[PDB]
Amino acid sequence: IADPEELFTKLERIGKGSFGEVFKGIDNRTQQVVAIKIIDLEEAEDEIEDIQQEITVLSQCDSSYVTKYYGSYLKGSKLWIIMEYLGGGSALDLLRAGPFDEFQIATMLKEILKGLDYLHSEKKIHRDIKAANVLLSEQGDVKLADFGVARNTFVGTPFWMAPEVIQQSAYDSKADIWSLGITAIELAKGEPPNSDMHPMRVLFLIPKNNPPTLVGDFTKSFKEFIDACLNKDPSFRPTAKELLKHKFIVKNSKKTSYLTELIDRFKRWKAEGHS
Ligand SMILES: N#CCC1C=CC(=Nc2nc(Nc3cc(C4CC4)[nH]n3)c3ccccc3n2)C=C1
């Protein structure tokens, strides 16, 4: 029990996520830039020791495709979670300057797929693949911010949810393949399919409707990639690994450093006047 208000300095706010706020921060002793997620567990003090149990296990993970956990510190009923800082922004931030071209998308999806194809020893992993959770380093490395293991009273956002997840079927890692498909549409178009519909309506249509498709004169191979992820039968969606060999990814992927151009493109958008 050392006080994190003294160990760390908050700089800018970077996230208005769910349980609280994420900050760009700095460790006062070592000067390492970090990400700090603060969550109030006032009435849920019993939850604390479990949350720190999980943070400690996560910090032993060896994936270079997830934002690493460094530890956590209790202050009052607030828990300060200390994580790796990535300075390039999320894909969703970068999308504000416009959708990405196919070579950028294939490059980004390949890095996501490498992280989905990673063997995790941790017990029951949950994932939330979407553009808000895809982070870029300043050098263009791609890491996901959704990674973890097993009183929240709201249903949630449906747009990236797989059919079998909604029909309440016991769901495996094929659900993340579906969500990756939706995220690919999000990167090409700017938003997930049916983003103009009421969420409760979307939640009912997902299991009943034919899968969404990419609208636009994109290459046939990109549309086939999307079609493969968005199979309605979990069993016939391909694995992360089969997808890493899809001709869309193989033909169009570039070195990850090329994604710095998206960072730069966001800078002139800002320089042009938030627009
Ligand atoms: N918790 C949680 C998920 C999450 C997902 C996205 C997110 N957005 C975001 N995150 C970051 N940076 C970040 C976030 C994290 C860590 C996930 C908390 N590590 N680095 C930046 C950095 C610079 C500009 C904009 C940024 N936006 C912040 C947090």
PDB file of C-alpha atoms and ligand atoms in Angstrom:
ATOM      1  CA  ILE A   1       0.000   0.000   0.000  1.00  0.00           C
ATOM      2  CA  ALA A   2       1.869   2.984  -1.424  1.00  0.00           C
ATOM      3  CA  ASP A   3      -0.164   5.997  -2.549  1.00  0.00           C
ATOM      4  CA  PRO A   4      -0.534   6.122  -6.356  1.00  0.00           C
ATOM      5  CA  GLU A   5      -1.391   9.858  -6.304  1.00  0.00           C
ATOM      6  CA  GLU A   6       2.230  10.349  -5.278  1.00  0.00           C
ATOM      7  CA  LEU A   7       3.703   7.586  -7.481  1.00  0.00           C
ATOM      8  CA  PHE A   8       2.045   8.802 -10.706  1.00  0.00           C
ATOM      9  CA  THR A   9       1.157  12.080 -12.364  1.00  0.00           C
ATOM     10  CA  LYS A  10      -1.975  12.289 -14.507  1.00  0.00           C
ATOM     11  CA  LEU A  11      -1.511  14.118 -17.813  1.00  0.00           C
ATOM     12  CA  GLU A  12      -4.329  14.244 -20.443  1.00  0.00           C
ATOM     13  CA  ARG A  13      -7.563  12.239 -20.262  1.00  0.00           C
ATOM     14  CA  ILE A  14      -7.611   9.681 -23.117  1.00  0.00           C
ATOM     15  CA  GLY A  15     -10.667   7.559 -22.344  1.00  0.00           C
ATOM     16  CA  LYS A  16     -14.302   8.026 -21.344  1.00  0.00           C
ATOM     17  CA  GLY A  17     -14.727   4.248 -21.396  1.00  0.00           C
ATOM     18  CA  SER A  18     -17.046   2.419 -18.981  1.00  0.00           C
ATOM     19  CA  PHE A  19     -16.090   1.995 -15.272  1.00  0.00           C
ATOM     20  CA  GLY A  20     -14.186   5.330 -15.322  1.00  0.00           C
ATOM     21  CA  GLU A  21     -11.484   7.371 -16.933  1.00  0.00           C
ATOM     22  CA  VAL A  22      -8.170   6.451 -18.527  1.00  0.00           C
ATOM     23  CA  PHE A  23      -5.304   8.880 -18.384  1.00  0.00           C
ATOM     24  CA  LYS A  24      -2.033   9.364 -20.055  1.00  0.00           C
ATOM     25  CA  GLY A  25       0.285   9.373 -17.086  1.00  0.00           C
ATOM     26  CA  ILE A  26       3.844   9.324 -15.951  1.00  0.00           C
ATOM     27  CA  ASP A  27       5.635   7.362 -13.192  1.00  0.00           C
ATOM     28  CA  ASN A  28       7.238   9.964 -10.923  1.00  0.00           C
ATOM     29  CA  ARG A  29      10.344   7.932 -10.055  1.00  0.00           C
ATOM     30  CA  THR A  30      11.327   6.426 -13.435  1.00  0.00           C
ATOM     31  CA  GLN A  31       9.647   8.799 -15.920  1.00  0.00           C
ATOM     32  CA  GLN A  32       7.971   5.965 -17.917  1.00  0.00           C
ATOM     33  CA  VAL A  33       4.840   7.176 -19.674  1.00  0.00           C
ATOM     34  CA  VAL A  34       1.965   4.884 -18.674  1.00  0.00           C
ATOM     35  CA  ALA A  35      -1.762   4.500 -19.106  1.00  0.00           C
ATOM     36  CA  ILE A  36      -3.770   4.785 -15.870  1.00  0.00           C
ATOM     37  CA  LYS A  37      -7.311   3.470 -15.654  1.00  0.00           C
ATOM     38  CA  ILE A  38      -9.109   4.501 -12.508  1.00  0.00           C
ATOM     39  CA  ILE A  39     -12.231   2.670 -11.365  1.00  0.00           C
ATOM     40  CA  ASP A  40     -14.365   3.399  -8.279  1.00  0.00           C
ATOM     41  CA  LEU A  41     -15.327   0.254  -6.402  1.00  0.00           C
ATOM     42  CA  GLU A  42     -17.038   2.094  -3.508  1.00  0.00           C
ATOM     43  CA  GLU A  43     -19.800  -0.379  -2.697  1.00  0.00           C
ATOM     44  CA  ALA A  44     -17.990  -3.244  -4.432  1.00  0.00           C
ATOM     45  CA  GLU A  45     -14.957  -3.532  -2.097  1.00  0.00           C
ATOM     46  CA  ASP A  46     -15.337  -7.348  -2.228  1.00  0.00           C
ATOM     47  CA  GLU A  47     -14.629  -7.197  -5.980  1.00  0.00           C
ATOM     48  CA  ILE A  48     -11.199  -5.500  -5.380  1.00  0.00           C
ATOM     49  CA  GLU A  49      -9.000  -8.476  -4.414  1.00  0.00           C
ATOM     50  CA  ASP A  50     -10.384 -10.448  -7.368  1.00  0.00           C
ATOM     51  CA  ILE A  51      -9.645  -7.577  -9.773  1.00  0.00           C
ATOM     52  CA  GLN A  52      -6.053  -7.296  -8.513  1.00  0.00           C
ATOM     53  CA  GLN A  53      -5.771 -11.099  -8.663  1.00  0.00           C
ATOM     54  CA  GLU A  54      -6.606 -10.949 -12.375  1.00  0.00           C
ATOM     55  CA  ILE A  55      -4.347  -7.878 -13.037  1.00  0.00           C
ATOM     56  CA  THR A  56      -1.387  -9.763 -11.562  1.00  0.00           C
ATOM     57  CA  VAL A  57      -1.991 -12.802 -13.752  1.00  0.00           C
ATOM     58  CA  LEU A  58      -2.461 -10.627 -16.828  1.00  0.00           C
ATOM     59  CA  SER A  59       0.851  -8.824 -16.161  1.00  0.00           C
ATOM     60  CA  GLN A  60       2.643 -12.235 -16.661  1.00  0.00           C
ATOM     61  CA  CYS A  61       1.250 -12.586 -20.176  1.00  0.00           C
ATOM     62  CA  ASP A  62       3.902 -12.584 -22.941  1.00  0.00           C
ATOM     63  CA  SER A  63       1.809 -11.353 -25.905  1.00  0.00           C
ATOM     64  CA  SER A  64       3.205  -8.380 -27.687  1.00  0.00           C
ATOM     65  CA  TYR A  65      -0.308  -7.826 -29.222  1.00  0.00           C
ATOM     66  CA  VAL A  66      -2.078  -6.775 -26.008  1.00  0.00           C
ATOM     67  CA  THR A  67      -1.494  -3.642 -23.926  1.00  0.00           C
ATOM     68  CA  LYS A  68       0.511  -4.941 -20.984  1.00  0.00           C
ATOM     69  CA  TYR A  69      -0.633  -4.614 -17.417  1.00  0.00           C
ATOM     70  CA  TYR A  70       1.971  -3.400 -14.915  1.00  0.00           C
ATOM     71  CA  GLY A  71      -0.024  -3.555 -11.704  1.00  0.00           C
ATOM     72  CA  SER A  72      -2.669  -1.807  -9.641  1.00  0.00           C
ATOM     73  CA  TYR A  73      -2.955   0.316  -6.500  1.00  0.00           C
ATOM     74  CA  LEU A  74      -5.911   0.889  -4.202  1.00  0.00           C
ATOM     75  CA  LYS A  75      -6.665   4.460  -3.113  1.00  0.00           C
ATOM     76  CA  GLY A  76      -9.844   4.760  -1.029  1.00  0.00           C
ATOM     77  CA  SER A  77     -12.357   2.736  -2.970  1.00  0.00           C
ATOM     78  CA  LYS A  78     -10.704   3.742  -6.265  1.00  0.00           C
ATOM     79  CA  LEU A  79      -8.418   1.298  -8.014  1.00  0.00           C
ATOM     80  CA  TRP A  80      -5.683   2.745 -10.258  1.00  0.00           C
ATOM     81  CA  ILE A  81      -4.755   0.252 -12.974  1.00  0.00           C
ATOM     82  CA  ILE A  82      -1.333   0.885 -14.544  1.00  0.00           C
ATOM     83  CA  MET A  83      -0.869  -0.174 -18.165  1.00  0.00           C
ATOM     84  CA  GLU A  84       1.355   0.194 -21.182  1.00  0.00           C
ATOM     85  CA  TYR A  85       0.889   3.509 -22.948  1.00  0.00           C
ATOM     86  CA  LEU A  86       0.443   3.526 -26.729  1.00  0.00           C
ATOM     87  CA  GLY A  87       0.702   6.964 -28.265  1.00  0.00           C
ATOM     88  CA  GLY A  88      -0.644   6.583 -31.744  1.00  0.00           C
ATOM     89  CA  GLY A  89      -4.338   6.579 -30.882  1.00  0.00           C
ATOM     90  CA  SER A  90      -7.085   3.989 -31.452  1.00  0.00           C
ATOM     91  CA  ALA A  91      -8.246   3.012 -34.931  1.00  0.00           C
ATOM     92  CA  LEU A  92     -11.534   4.706 -34.067  1.00  0.00           C
ATOM     93  CA  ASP A  93      -9.668   7.976 -33.276  1.00  0.00           C
ATOM     94  CA  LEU A  94      -7.792   7.712 -36.537  1.00  0.00           C
ATOM     95  CA  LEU A  95     -11.015   7.040 -38.494  1.00  0.00           C
ATOM     96  CA  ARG A  96     -12.232  10.528 -37.634  1.00  0.00           C
ATOM     97  CA  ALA A  97      -9.960  11.754 -40.464  1.00  0.00           C
ATOM     98  CA  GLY A  98     -11.801   9.378 -42.866  1.00  0.00           C
ATOM     99  CA  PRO A  99     -11.869   5.634 -43.621  1.00  0.00           C
ATOM    100  CA  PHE A 100      -8.703   3.689 -44.298  1.00  0.00           C
ATOM    101  CA  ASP A 101      -7.567   2.376 -47.683  1.00  0.00           C
ATOM    102  CA  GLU A 102      -7.337  -1.408 -48.271  1.00  0.00           C
ATOM    103  CA  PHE A 103      -3.591  -1.660 -47.846  1.00  0.00           C
ATOM    104  CA  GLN A 104      -3.901   0.071 -44.457  1.00  0.00           C
ATOM    105  CA  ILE A 105      -6.831  -2.177 -43.549  1.00  0.00           C
ATOM    106  CA  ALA A 106      -5.049  -5.456 -44.522  1.00  0.00           C
ATOM    107  CA  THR A 107      -1.970  -4.361 -42.607  1.00  0.00           C
ATOM    108  CA  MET A 108      -4.025  -3.528 -39.516  1.00  0.00           C
ATOM    109  CA  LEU A 109      -6.109  -6.710 -39.692  1.00  0.00           C
ATOM    110  CA  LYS A 110      -2.984  -8.857 -40.078  1.00  0.00           C
ATOM    111  CA  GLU A 111      -1.593  -7.519 -36.809  1.00  0.00           C
ATOM    112  CA  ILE A 112      -4.928  -8.112 -35.094  1.00  0.00           C
ATOM    113  CA  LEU A 113      -5.043 -11.638 -36.488  1.00  0.00           C
ATOM    114  CA  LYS A 114      -1.491 -12.341 -35.232  1.00  0.00           C
ATOM    115  CA  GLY A 115      -2.737 -11.494 -31.737  1.00  0.00           C
ATOM    116  CA  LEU A 116      -5.819 -13.705 -32.149  1.00  0.00           C
ATOM    117  CA  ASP A 117      -3.554 -16.490 -33.324  1.00  0.00           C
ATOM    118  CA  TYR A 118      -1.468 -16.212 -30.160  1.00  0.00           C
ATOM    119  CA  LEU A 119      -1.584 -19.152 -27.655  1.00  0.00           C
ATOM    120  CA  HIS A 120      -2.843 -17.771 -24.328  1.00  0.00           C
ATOM    121  CA  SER A 121      -2.349 -19.929 -21.199  1.00  0.00           C
ATOM    122  CA  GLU A 122      -4.917 -17.888 -19.252  1.00  0.00           C
ATOM    123  CA  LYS A 123      -8.079 -19.729 -18.464  1.00  0.00           C
ATOM    124  CA  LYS A 124     -11.202 -18.182 -19.977  1.00  0.00           C
ATOM    125  CA  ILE A 125     -10.258 -15.252 -22.055  1.00  0.00           C
ATOM    126  CA  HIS A 126     -12.845 -12.699 -23.071  1.00  0.00           C
ATOM    127  CA  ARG A 127     -12.264 -10.420 -26.114  1.00  0.00           C
ATOM    128  CA  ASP A 128     -13.988  -7.341 -27.499  1.00  0.00           C
ATOM    129  CA  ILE A 129     -12.677  -6.772 -31.012  1.00  0.00           C
ATOM    130  CA  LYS A 130     -13.603  -3.359 -32.370  1.00  0.00           C
ATOM    131  CA  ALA A 131     -11.890  -0.295 -33.662  1.00  0.00           C
ATOM    132  CA  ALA A 132     -12.164   1.545 -30.329  1.00  0.00           C
ATOM    133  CA  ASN A 133     -10.033  -1.244 -28.827  1.00  0.00           C
ATOM    134  CA  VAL A 134      -7.385  -1.312 -31.536  1.00  0.00           C
ATOM    135  CA  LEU A 135      -4.398   0.868 -30.454  1.00  0.00           C
ATOM    136  CA  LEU A 136      -1.380   2.043 -32.459  1.00  0.00           C
ATOM    137  CA  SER A 137       2.060   2.763 -31.067  1.00  0.00           C
ATOM    138  CA  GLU A 138       3.807   5.867 -32.436  1.00  0.00           C
ATOM    139  CA  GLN A 139       5.866   3.444 -34.618  1.00  0.00           C
ATOM    140  CA  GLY A 140       2.700   1.729 -35.924  1.00  0.00           C
ATOM    141  CA  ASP A 141       2.560  -1.414 -33.782  1.00  0.00           C
ATOM    142  CA  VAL A 142      -0.956  -2.690 -33.281  1.00  0.00           C
ATOM    143  CA  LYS A 143      -2.150  -3.854 -29.896  1.00  0.00           C
ATOM    144  CA  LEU A 144      -5.574  -4.644 -28.548  1.00  0.00           C
ATOM    145  CA  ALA A 145      -6.907  -3.084 -25.365  1.00  0.00           C
ATOM    146  CA  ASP A 146      -9.796  -5.542 -24.785  1.00  0.00           C
ATOM    147  CA  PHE A 147      -7.835  -8.394 -23.290  1.00  0.00           C
ATOM    148  CA  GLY A 148      -8.891 -10.150 -20.024  1.00  0.00           C
ATOM    149  CA  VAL A 149     -10.318 -13.298 -18.321  1.00  0.00           C
ATOM    150  CA  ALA A 150     -13.527 -14.239 -16.389  1.00  0.00           C
ATOM    151  CA  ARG A 151     -23.812  -5.942 -10.722  1.00  0.00           C
ATOM    152  CA  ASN A 152     -23.702  -4.843 -14.379  1.00  0.00           C
ATOM    153  CA  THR A 153     -27.302  -4.258 -15.331  1.00  0.00           C
ATOM    154  CA  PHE A 154     -27.252  -3.088 -18.974  1.00  0.00           C
ATOM    155  CA  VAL A 155     -27.405  -5.273 -22.131  1.00  0.00           C
ATOM    156  CA  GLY A 156     -24.729  -3.279 -23.984  1.00  0.00           C
ATOM    157  CA  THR A 157     -23.847  -2.377 -27.577  1.00  0.00           C
ATOM    158  CA  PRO A 158     -24.830  -5.019 -30.134  1.00  0.00           C
ATOM    159  CA  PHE A 159     -23.115  -3.988 -33.329  1.00  0.00           C
ATOM    160  CA  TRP A 160     -20.115  -6.352 -33.114  1.00  0.00           C
ATOM    161  CA  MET A 161     -21.933  -9.237 -31.395  1.00  0.00           C
ATOM    162  CA  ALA A 162     -22.085 -12.603 -33.126  1.00  0.00           C
ATOM    163  CA  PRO A 163     -25.366 -14.364 -33.783  1.00  0.00           C
ATOM    164  CA  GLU A 164     -24.545 -17.291 -31.443  1.00  0.00           C
ATOM    165  CA  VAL A 165     -23.605 -14.828 -28.668  1.00  0.00           C
ATOM    166  CA  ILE A 166     -27.086 -13.261 -28.898  1.00  0.00           C
ATOM    167  CA  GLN A 167     -28.981 -16.526 -29.193  1.00  0.00           C
ATOM    168  CA  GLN A 168     -27.219 -17.248 -25.857  1.00  0.00           C
ATOM    169  CA  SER A 169     -25.460 -20.348 -27.240  1.00  0.00           C
ATOM    170  CA  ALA A 170     -22.197 -21.407 -25.513  1.00  0.00           C
ATOM    171  CA  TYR A 171     -19.697 -19.360 -27.542  1.00  0.00           C
ATOM    172  CA  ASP A 172     -16.007 -19.898 -28.297  1.00  0.00           C
ATOM    173  CA  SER A 173     -13.312 -17.880 -30.104  1.00  0.00           C
ATOM    174  CA  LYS A 174     -15.289 -17.969 -33.389  1.00  0.00           C
ATOM    175  CA  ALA A 175     -17.303 -15.063 -32.029  1.00  0.00           C
ATOM    176  CA  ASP A 176     -14.121 -12.915 -32.209  1.00  0.00           C
ATOM    177  CA  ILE A 177     -13.847 -13.907 -35.905  1.00  0.00           C
ATOM    178  CA  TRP A 178     -17.318 -12.482 -36.445  1.00  0.00           C
ATOM    179  CA  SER A 179     -16.425  -9.329 -34.541  1.00  0.00           C
ATOM    180  CA  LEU A 180     -13.265  -9.004 -36.609  1.00  0.00           C
ATOM    181  CA  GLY A 181     -15.466  -9.089 -39.698  1.00  0.00           C
ATOM    182  CA  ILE A 182     -17.658  -6.270 -38.364  1.00  0.00           C
ATOM    183  CA  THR A 183     -14.433  -4.359 -37.462  1.00  0.00           C
ATOM    184  CA  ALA A 184     -13.226  -4.751 -41.042  1.00  0.00           C
ATOM    185  CA  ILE A 185     -16.441  -3.131 -42.286  1.00  0.00           C
ATOM    186  CA  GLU A 186     -15.934  -0.450 -39.627  1.00  0.00           C
ATOM    187  CA  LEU A 187     -12.451   0.329 -40.971  1.00  0.00           C
ATOM    188  CA  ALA A 188     -13.581   0.522 -44.599  1.00  0.00           C
ATOM    189  CA  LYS A 189     -16.818   2.388 -44.100  1.00  0.00           C
ATOM    190  CA  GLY A 190     -16.220   4.376 -40.817  1.00  0.00           C
ATOM    191  CA  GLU A 191     -18.876   2.556 -38.813  1.00  0.00           C
ATOM    192  CA  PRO A 192     -20.282  -0.911 -38.215  1.00  0.00           C
ATOM    193  CA  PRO A 193     -23.204  -2.027 -40.390  1.00  0.00           C
ATOM    194  CA  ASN A 194     -26.676  -0.815 -39.303  1.00  0.00           C
ATOM    195  CA  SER A 195     -25.195   1.890 -37.064  1.00  0.00           C
ATOM    196  CA  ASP A 196     -28.140   4.106 -38.027  1.00  0.00           C
ATOM    197  CA  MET A 197     -30.670   1.664 -36.505  1.00  0.00           C
ATOM    198  CA  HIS A 198     -31.897   1.518 -32.898  1.00  0.00           C
ATOM    199  CA  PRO A 199     -29.629  -0.902 -30.916  1.00  0.00           C
ATOM    200  CA  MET A 200     -32.446  -3.032 -29.556  1.00  0.00           C
ATOM    201  CA  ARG A 201     -33.736  -3.454 -33.090  1.00  0.00           C
ATOM    202  CA  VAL A 202     -30.211  -4.410 -34.298  1.00  0.00           C
ATOM    203  CA  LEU A 203     -29.953  -6.957 -31.446  1.00  0.00           C
ATOM    204  CA  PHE A 204     -32.975  -8.870 -32.713  1.00  0.00           C
ATOM    205  CA  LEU A 205     -32.059  -8.656 -36.410  1.00  0.00           C
ATOM    206  CA  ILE A 206     -28.566 -10.073 -36.108  1.00  0.00           C
ATOM    207  CA  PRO A 207     -29.559 -13.744 -35.560  1.00  0.00           C
ATOM    208  CA  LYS A 208     -32.480 -13.500 -38.059  1.00  0.00           C
ATOM    209  CA  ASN A 209     -30.900 -11.624 -41.013  1.00  0.00           C
ATOM    210  CA  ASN A 210     -28.340 -12.657 -43.573  1.00  0.00           C
ATOM    211  CA  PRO A 211     -24.914 -11.417 -42.491  1.00  0.00           C
ATOM    212  CA  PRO A 212     -24.047  -7.808 -43.322  1.00  0.00           C
ATOM    213  CA  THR A 213     -21.814  -7.067 -46.308  1.00  0.00           C
ATOM    214  CA  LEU A 214     -19.355  -4.347 -47.344  1.00  0.00           C
ATOM    215  CA  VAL A 215     -21.071  -1.609 -49.340  1.00  0.00           C
ATOM    216  CA  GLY A 216     -18.713   0.031 -51.877  1.00  0.00           C
ATOM    217  CA  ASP A 217     -16.648  -0.898 -54.962  1.00  0.00           C
ATOM    218  CA  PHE A 218     -13.982  -2.670 -52.884  1.00  0.00           C
ATOM    219  CA  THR A 219     -11.922  -5.526 -54.342  1.00  0.00           C
ATOM    220  CA  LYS A 220     -13.631  -8.886 -54.512  1.00  0.00           C
ATOM    221  CA  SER A 221     -11.009 -10.423 -52.230  1.00  0.00           C
ATOM    222  CA  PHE A 222     -11.693  -7.943 -49.441  1.00  0.00           C
ATOM    223  CA  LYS A 223     -15.424  -8.682 -49.742  1.00  0.00           C
ATOM    224  CA  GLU A 224     -14.645 -12.437 -49.661  1.00  0.00           C
ATOM    225  CA  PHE A 225     -12.493 -11.978 -46.553  1.00  0.00           C
ATOM    226  CA  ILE A 226     -15.436 -10.211 -44.869  1.00  0.00           C
ATOM    227  CA  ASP A 227     -17.873 -12.891 -46.097  1.00  0.00           C
ATOM    228  CA  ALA A 228     -15.732 -15.592 -44.527  1.00  0.00           C
ATOM    229  CA  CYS A 229     -15.562 -13.922 -41.086  1.00  0.00           C
ATOM    230  CA  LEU A 230     -19.306 -13.207 -41.214  1.00  0.00           C
ATOM    231  CA  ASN A 231     -20.535 -16.716 -41.721  1.00  0.00           C
ATOM    232  CA  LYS A 232     -23.581 -17.234 -39.639  1.00  0.00           C
ATOM    233  CA  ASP A 233     -22.565 -20.753 -38.610  1.00  0.00           C
ATOM    234  CA  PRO A 234     -19.727 -20.537 -36.099  1.00  0.00           C
ATOM    235  CA  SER A 235     -18.375 -23.920 -37.267  1.00  0.00           C
ATOM    236  CA  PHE A 236     -17.747 -22.593 -40.817  1.00  0.00           C
ATOM    237  CA  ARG A 237     -16.014 -19.350 -39.840  1.00  0.00           C
ATOM    238  CA  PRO A 238     -12.298 -19.803 -40.373  1.00  0.00           C
ATOM    239  CA  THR A 239      -9.662 -19.593 -37.604  1.00  0.00           C
ATOM    240  CA  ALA A 240      -7.380 -16.558 -37.100  1.00  0.00           C
ATOM    241  CA  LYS A 241      -4.694 -18.628 -38.648  1.00  0.00           C
ATOM    242  CA  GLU A 242      -6.626 -19.670 -41.769  1.00  0.00           C
ATOM    243  CA  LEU A 243      -7.458 -15.960 -42.195  1.00  0.00           C
ATOM    244  CA  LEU A 244      -3.788 -14.883 -41.977  1.00  0.00           C
ATOM    245  CA  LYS A 245      -3.348 -16.821 -45.225  1.00  0.00           C
ATOM    246  CA  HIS A 246      -6.332 -15.302 -46.974  1.00  0.00           C
ATOM    247  CA  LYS A 247      -5.382 -13.698 -50.262  1.00  0.00           C
ATOM    248  CA  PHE A 248      -6.782 -10.357 -49.099  1.00  0.00           C
ATOM    249  CA  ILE A 249      -4.213 -10.229 -46.274  1.00  0.00           C
ATOM    250  CA  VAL A 250      -1.325 -11.810 -48.198  1.00  0.00           C
ATOM    251  CA  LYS A 251      -1.747  -9.583 -51.328  1.00  0.00           C
ATOM    252  CA  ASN A 252      -2.390  -6.293 -49.530  1.00  0.00           C
ATOM    253  CA  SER A 253      -0.387  -6.339 -46.274  1.00  0.00           C
ATOM    254  CA  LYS A 254       2.518  -3.926 -45.893  1.00  0.00           C
ATOM    255  CA  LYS A 255       5.099  -3.404 -43.137  1.00  0.00           C
ATOM    256  CA  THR A 256       3.302  -2.149 -40.000  1.00  0.00           C
ATOM    257  CA  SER A 257       5.400   1.025 -40.049  1.00  0.00           C
ATOM    258  CA  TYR A 258       3.278   2.131 -43.036  1.00  0.00           C
ATOM    259  CA  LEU A 259       0.393   2.707 -40.549  1.00  0.00           C
ATOM    260  CA  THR A 260       2.244   5.780 -39.227  1.00  0.00           C
ATOM    261  CA  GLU A 261       0.676   7.497 -42.274  1.00  0.00           C
ATOM    262  CA  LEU A 262      -2.703   7.184 -40.496  1.00  0.00           C
ATOM    263  CA  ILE A 263      -1.206   8.899 -37.451  1.00  0.00           C
ATOM    264  CA  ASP A 264       0.156  11.703 -39.685  1.00  0.00           C
ATOM    265  CA  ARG A 265      -3.179  11.898 -41.511  1.00  0.00           C
ATOM    266  CA  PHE A 266      -4.889  12.477 -38.195  1.00  0.00           C
ATOM    267  CA  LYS A 267      -2.387  15.229 -37.391  1.00  0.00           C
ATOM    268  CA  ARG A 268      -3.214  17.367 -40.495  1.00  0.00           C
ATOM    269  CA  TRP A 269      -6.905  16.803 -39.895  1.00  0.00           C
ATOM    270  CA  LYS A 270      -6.296  18.379 -36.469  1.00  0.00           C
ATOM    271  CA  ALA A 271      -3.996  20.998 -38.070  1.00  0.00           C
ATOM    272  CA  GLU A 272      -6.745  21.753 -40.704  1.00  0.00           C
ATOM    273  CA  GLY A 273      -9.056  22.777 -37.809  1.00  0.00           C
ATOM    274  CA  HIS A 274     -10.600  19.679 -36.145  1.00  0.00           C
ATOM    275  CA  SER A 275     -11.967  18.953 -39.617  1.00  0.00           C
TER     276      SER A 275
HETATM  277  N1  LIG B   1      -9.601   0.700 -20.688  1.00  0.00           N
HETATM  278  C1  LIG B   1      -9.668   0.608 -21.820  1.00  0.00           C
HETATM  279  C2  LIG B   1      -9.769   0.477 -23.272  1.00  0.00           C
HETATM  280  C3  LIG B   1      -9.353   1.720 -24.070  1.00  0.00           C
HETATM  281  C4  LIG B   1      -9.549   1.731 -25.449  1.00  0.00           C
HETATM  282  C5  LIG B   1      -9.203   2.841 -26.228  1.00  0.00           C
HETATM  283  C6  LIG B   1      -8.607   3.925 -25.627  1.00  0.00           C
HETATM  284  N2  LIG B   1      -8.297   4.960 -26.382  1.00  0.00           N
HETATM  285  C7  LIG B   1      -7.101   5.538 -26.433  1.00  0.00           C
HETATM  286  N3  LIG B   1      -6.028   4.990 -25.815  1.00  0.00           N
HETATM  287  C8  LIG B   1      -4.814   5.556 -25.874  1.00  0.00           C
HETATM  288  N4  LIG B   1      -3.708   5.016 -25.269  1.00  0.00           N
HETATM  289  C9  LIG B   1      -3.659   3.911 -24.462  1.00  0.00           C
HETATM  290  C10 LIG B   1      -4.627   3.261 -23.786  1.00  0.00           C
HETATM  291  C11 LIG B   1      -3.980   2.268 -23.171  1.00  0.00           C
HETATM  292  C12 LIG B   1      -4.556   1.174 -22.231  1.00  0.00           C
HETATM  293  C13 LIG B   1      -5.892   0.600 -22.675  1.00  0.00           C
HETATM  294  C14 LIG B   1      -5.830   1.512 -21.461  1.00  0.00           C
HETATM  295  N5  LIG B   1      -2.699   2.336 -23.464  1.00  0.00           N
HETATM  296  N6  LIG B   1      -2.508   3.310 -24.206  1.00  0.00           N
HETATM  297  C15 LIG B   1      -4.711   6.739 -26.619  1.00  0.00           C
HETATM  298  C16 LIG B   1      -3.483   7.393 -26.756  1.00  0.00           C
HETATM  299  C17 LIG B   1      -3.388   8.584 -27.485  1.00  0.00           C
HETATM  300  C18 LIG B   1      -4.512   9.135 -28.112  1.00  0.00           C
HETATM  301  C19 LIG B   1      -5.730   8.468 -28.007  1.00  0.00           C
HETATM  302  C20 LIG B   1      -5.832   7.279 -27.249  1.00  0.00           C
HETATM  303  N7  LIG B   1      -7.014   6.662 -27.158  1.00  0.00           N
HETATM  304  C21 LIG B   1      -8.432   3.931 -24.252  1.00  0.00           C
HETATM  305  C22 LIG B   1      -8.776   2.829 -23.465  1.00  0.00           C
END
